[PDB]
Structure of Cycloisomaltooligosaccharide glucanotransferase:
Amino acid sequence: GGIERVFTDKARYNPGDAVSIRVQAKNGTGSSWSGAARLEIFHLENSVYTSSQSLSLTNGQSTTLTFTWTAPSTDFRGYFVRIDAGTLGQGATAIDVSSDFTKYPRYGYISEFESGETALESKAKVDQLAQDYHINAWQFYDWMWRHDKMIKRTGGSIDSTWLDLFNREISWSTLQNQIDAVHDVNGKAMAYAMIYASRENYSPLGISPTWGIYEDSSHTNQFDVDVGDGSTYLYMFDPQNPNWQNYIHAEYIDSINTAGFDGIHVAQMGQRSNVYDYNGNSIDLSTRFSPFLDQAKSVLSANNPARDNLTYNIVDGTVNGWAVNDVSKNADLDFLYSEIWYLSDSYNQLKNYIEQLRANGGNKAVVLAAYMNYADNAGTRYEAESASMTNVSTNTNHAGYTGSGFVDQFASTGDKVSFAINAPEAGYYSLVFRYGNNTGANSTLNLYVDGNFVQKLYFFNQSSWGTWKHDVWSQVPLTQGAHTVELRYESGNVGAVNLDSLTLGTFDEHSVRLADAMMSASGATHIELGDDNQMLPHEYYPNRSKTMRSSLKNAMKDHYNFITAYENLLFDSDVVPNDTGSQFVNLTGVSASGDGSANTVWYINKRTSDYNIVHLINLLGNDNQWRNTASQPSFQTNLPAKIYIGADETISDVYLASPDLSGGETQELAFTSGTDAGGKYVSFTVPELKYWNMIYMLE
Ligand SMILES: OC[C@H]1O[C@H](OC[C@H]2O[C@H](OC[C@H]3O[C@H](OC[C@H]4O[C@@H](O)[C@H](O)[C@@H](O)[C@@H]4O)[C@H](O)[C@@H](O)[C@@H]3O)[C@H](O)[C@@H](O)[C@@H]2O)[C@H](O)[C@@H](O)[C@@H]1O
Ligand SMILES: [Ca+2]
Ligand code: NA
């Protein structure tokens, strides 16, 4: 398919906006090509536009066609887009018509703001997410100077740079440029801010400890957060206290008006117990965010209804988890957001949590933060003891190492380890080192790639020498083919390490497709893409300890088209579970389950006013954790399926759309029904199941 890309200028359109569908093509079949480009746009199963254009290309040549469309007056509609060019190829994209991003958030992030970033580089990184995945809002992570003094001013004047709490340079022009670029794609820019945090030494800013929350009832220890340099701390505060609300809401408003943000992403540290105010009163923090969020929304909307967007992080998401009910039910948020840790590990546990959220929020959209392959050091491993070491030998004395051993006593000047690696395709590669360090402090080593120094690299001190870690990395660009990565213990390097391996930090395509399918099926979206086409590997968004390869980038384009086009079926306000009916799916040859059981095909049972919807999630040959890496599922071809229904439900037609299958185009299938011992049925053959099928049946 030498139809290379299909996309749109903007990332969400309004009803009646012009819409420019672009089509990048390129002939590479030896000799000229003449024919047409047949654009066809669907709403679920109904073609609603069709158009054609002449196209001829010599061998080798490229062009970009524009097709122009008018978004239909019906607000809040997702559309599939087909382009066919006969033997040249095909491609696809989706279009979302919504006056408001908060009905169908597709949430990304920006976390870098270097002053070396030209306005053009800024526009290019934003355009890529907008075009490839239809992002409609970006969370700006760690843009602020201080958590309690977000825009840094000298007098009245705004400082053109400032240093954030890990000492990064944040550039105001870069920041402003990004927000404009976001705004070009009719994007929205959400500002990160904590609900309760000041930085240290907050008194001369006129913040009062009397507004604080405390570990005890003598106001002797304020809750805090050691960021870990001995100076830099977050101190926590009472969200219901009016003076705190006043102080911090003011900086919220300052950010909207001064920086041009469209709303605020309010965060929190999560759960805390046996909590007191300054005066000594015991208080349940879990119920206290809703009042603050309510008042937040109220001043944001008075300040400016066009830029009054709001959400809150419900941290450690699970069914009836901490502050889960109070926030989701009573907090005046525009869409719900939750960071999942280790209390919803099964695909099913997580399906049930999203379900609770949708229920409690009145089917208002849910986004999850769920960092994939977090625990796992995934990607291609290059063993340190297979490699080329100057002045150091292998050992096997401390345990937990991988392959045959590791390199010891990387202690002394002129020590060296060199990895002869190969990079399948051009692009960014995460260099992830597994190490030991029990020196007593940080150890350092210098990182050379292809004879050039990249970085000094700090290895953290650990409990024992038997304690291995892989949380030291460097992202570097690479041409396809052989390359040399080496560490040198040079002059200025300190301490010592054991070295176990180099891994090319890579997200695992299989886990991720499944995790996303699961979430979208269940009714959610996943903040997972940001900056220059990075995927989110950690809670600290600037972490680049893992990269997607072309393969997963393709999968996500397919996926994000999918949850854009069929968004009315996944996320609309009347898309509810279809649970009360002993409902059952029968599959010939393969065992199924409705509770996401390892090594099965998981049917999930949802419905709307007009459609009966089954999702199938191929867990064949794979376990039931959502977060861990995975094997390629057992691909099923020509698969007989049987679906049961209520006696008052007759099926006009039956459709199956899947992102694993023709970019997610809908296909109609052959089917009749009858009746038998286990209720009234309907049946058909599933042509292919790979990762995720969305069967939707019109009634
Ligand atoms: O020390 C080495 C260490 O470096 C990196 O991790 C840095 C730390 O990341 C996080 O702390 C920074 C983070 O703290 C507050 O927000 C916390 C958290 O809030 C959640 O609501 C949100 O969803 C998260 O995205 C967010 O991180 C501040 O408000 C924020 O400004 C600040 O950025 C994390 O809490 C620490 O544990 C980390 O050390 C590397 O990524 C890490 O591997 C390494 O160990
Ligand atoms: Ca090893
Ligand atoms: Na898994």
Residues 574-699 form a domain with the Immunoglobulin-like fold (CATH 2.60.40.1180).
